[model samples]
Target: DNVNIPDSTFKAYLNGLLGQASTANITEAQMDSLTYITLANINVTDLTGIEYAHNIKDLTINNIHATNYNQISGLSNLERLRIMGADVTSDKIPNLSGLTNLTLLDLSHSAHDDSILTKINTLPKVTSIDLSYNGAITDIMPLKTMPELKSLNIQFDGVHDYRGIEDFPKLNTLLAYSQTIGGKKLINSDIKSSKLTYNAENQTLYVPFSLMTERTVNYDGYVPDFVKSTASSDTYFTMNEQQVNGNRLTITSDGLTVSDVSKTDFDNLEKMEYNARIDLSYQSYNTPEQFQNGGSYTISMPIYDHYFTVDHSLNITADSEKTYIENQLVTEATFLSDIHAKTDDGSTVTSDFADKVDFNTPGTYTVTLQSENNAGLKATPVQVNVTIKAKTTITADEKITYKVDTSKTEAAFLADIKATTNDGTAITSDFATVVDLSKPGKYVVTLNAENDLQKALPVQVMVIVEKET
Candidate 1:
């Protein structure tokens, strides 16, 4: 027989489920026999018809825009209930105490008060729950009482203090990030068989479970000095700040033996530049529950003590006589050799003089030599002075004719004939006073000029002499 239904929307829902043309086609027995029902996007504001579905084991009602959840109290047999985006508040959350068979519940991305957690904890069989993106939930103390819970994700929540999780002995999985919890940081000794992570930027602590505990010791002092000059039979190397909490300990060394190598070998090895290594073995007790028998652990670390100091005792003797002609390219190697400069490490040294050298201009310039070691450490720089001289070209084509008196002496006649260079450089002659210029038809005179840099470009000019012109 058909039951008397008062709500029109509830009758329409039952009619659609029965595949009937009208509400009169659905009977009360068919509604009571439903074990699974999905009422998604139905636009129903009231959930009054849910009481009729007493045998429902799996129910999903998403995006229903419902504000009241009181009608869901009768679904005691429901094992899985997913109600998302329903805008259900704390007062509207129906009493789920009767839902003892519920195992999985998803209220993610929903707007609900913190009281919803209190009601969810009453379900004793729930093993996995996702309360992620529930911004309104600030307290998670209710989760401590859920003993059967094995996996949980509470990301983007305001709940702090995860120490209560120690009570859940069966829990093996937890996912939380961006939590702002402060106090004693979480240590590896807290949990077993679970992976927990926290962002260091937010100051949240995340501890890991390891097989063994380890520490590192840094080598002291520089090489050569690091090797002591004690008796050859004494112990040469020792481990520092090493702590072991478990049983069965062993140590080994490499690169240099403690007592076998002589003092000469130690000093030679330091000069040759070689590193050392040490290995440790012990039983670990950090694994809380997995391996109670404790397995063997081994760790290796490097011992480094290499240091180098560079000496810059460069003796640069500047060659003031070293000169370059105008418009000439200066070779850096030839310039450095002229200054008598060399590095201690026998490396190629450079200077700003390479880039600043202008052979076209005549002047005195200072060049600084600098060098660096293979380790990129710079040494004290040395400077020297260099000079660039002008190149002078003389010509006598404009006035080559010179009148020399044949009656005068040869020294006086040669001195009266003078020549000028085109570059305004003073001309000088290498010829002595013995040259016969008294009866000359054409006399060849070698002229030269030199700047402060002392560069020379010799020019020769021909002088014609007419007797008594």
Candidate 2:
């Protein structure tokens, strides 16, 4: 049998979902066939048979007049219910006790009392709630028990007191009043989405250092100083003025950079916090006032401080070629210019090079220039190629006439022929081989031998020898 619908405004609209425009009767089959129902712009007087729609998942009764809404309690599968501008005539409001699946609810611009908050809190999975423009509600204490509440819209005349909201550990955003209605931190605090972390006790929002500059955020209370700003003449670092034009003032902050904290300074810190200064200001619609730039503020952010470590790296450059004569008189100080390194830790550079090489021996050598700082930290050892050569300058008497004879001992023939190195070291020669002592006419000879400086010498001279002619 069809049940006689009581509401004439709703009975005619049911003709679309069922053939009930003429009979004004709706059957269980017609009710079962419906999944969603909407009553837009109508002053719904009575909807007695709507509770039988077991499969109704979405119901929108945005009409200002709604009576017998308690019949909607039978909608076991109702997941989303929106009745904007709900004007209750017969009952208080819809009984939502059986709406276990209701995850979203909107009762904005309605005339519901504070008891609605208790009914809304019973829905275990409701994350978002909109209760704006409902002047009937003043206290927001009941809504604070929700842990899964992510978004709460209690704007304008909805709530008078906004304390105890801190209990919502999982609340992501709170869109409250447009201006402070005489309260503390949350009086006009609009906790913007995920951008800032809120600690209501301190009335501080933890913002990133990068976002502190030029980005506009409006709030009535204080923001925590996570890091200090280094901008010298910038207006964003400390408390400054923001135009309070209708909306809350958009506050901006100047932040700190990687170079602001040195590794030495960072190492001394007990935690990741760095002291900083910045000025944040905002504009409010009701109170258009200027804020003073407080002397200090803090900025917090993820740090790569160890990467800012003092540049202890050893830097040594090559002079293209390091050339030194064999047995060259050089102290470590001789190459001090090339070995001098720099460090920021205020330590003298300990460079090792001169002591590692045997300059007396002539050869191509690779000397590794090792440099270390006061902390004993070593950089990439610099390899420098050193070249040591024997002294090439050989000095001797310009004219030498020596009787060449291998039997008179190679020394006696060369005794009168005095050949020396540049440093005056006497030397031997290949003169005996040059001149034949058995039949020595006028001949030529050269002095080439090793000396105290350890290099063979070379000197040309003429030998005039007549062997018992």
- Which candidate has the highest TM-score of all? 2
lDDT per residue (tens digit) for residues 1-469 in model 1? 5566565665687777777765555566887878787877767677665677778899887777776777777577889887777375556677677777788777766766578877777777887777765655555657778767766665554444343444655565554432211111211222221132323344222222121121122112111111222222221222122221112112222122232333232222211111212121132112223113342111112122221121223333344345676677767877777675555545656777877667777787777777764344345667766677656665444225446653444344334554454465566665443235466577665656665544356756566667763
Q: Alpha-carbon error at 454 in model 2, in Å? A: 99
Which candidate gets the maximum lDDT versus the true structure? 2
* Model 1 spans with C-alpha error above 4 angstroms: 1-7, 22-25, 178-469
The TM-scores of all predictions, comma-separated, are: 0.37, 0.38
Report the C-alpha displacement of residue 58, candidate 1, in angstroms.
0.8
What range of 10 consecutive residues in model 2 has the weakest lDDT sum? Answer: 300-309
Q: By how many angstroms RMSD does model 2 differ from the true structure?
A: 22.0
- Where is model 2 more than 4 Å wrong at Cα? 19-24, 89-91, 179-469
lDDT of each: 0.52, 0.53
